[PDB]
Symmetry: C2
Subunit: 48 residues, 2 copies
């Protein structure tokens, strides 16, 4: 049921509460490693 806006808002709140995650994601994205970030997080979530 949750919409994309609700998912984004939930992640936004999580990033604010966990600055390490925000800083690590920005570092990976801004340094051109976002594709490795996508692949790694998707694989982890699919193996729940």
């Amino acid at each position: 049921i949750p919409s994309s806006q609700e998912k984004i808002a939930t992640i936004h709140e999580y990033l604010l509460e966990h600055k390490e995650l925000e800083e690590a994601m920005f570092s990976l994205i801004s340094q051109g490693r976002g594709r490795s970030l996508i692949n790694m997080v998707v694989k982890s979530a699919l193996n729940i």
Copy 2:
């Protein structure tokens, strides 16, 4: 130099362009696996 607001806004734009990442992060966070998400992304970013 980039501020927290700029980092968050950069991630927001990235999530919108890559729905898989948004969906995988929400799935991990909402199912109580956010700590594993933090640890995995931080380690990857530190090994750049």
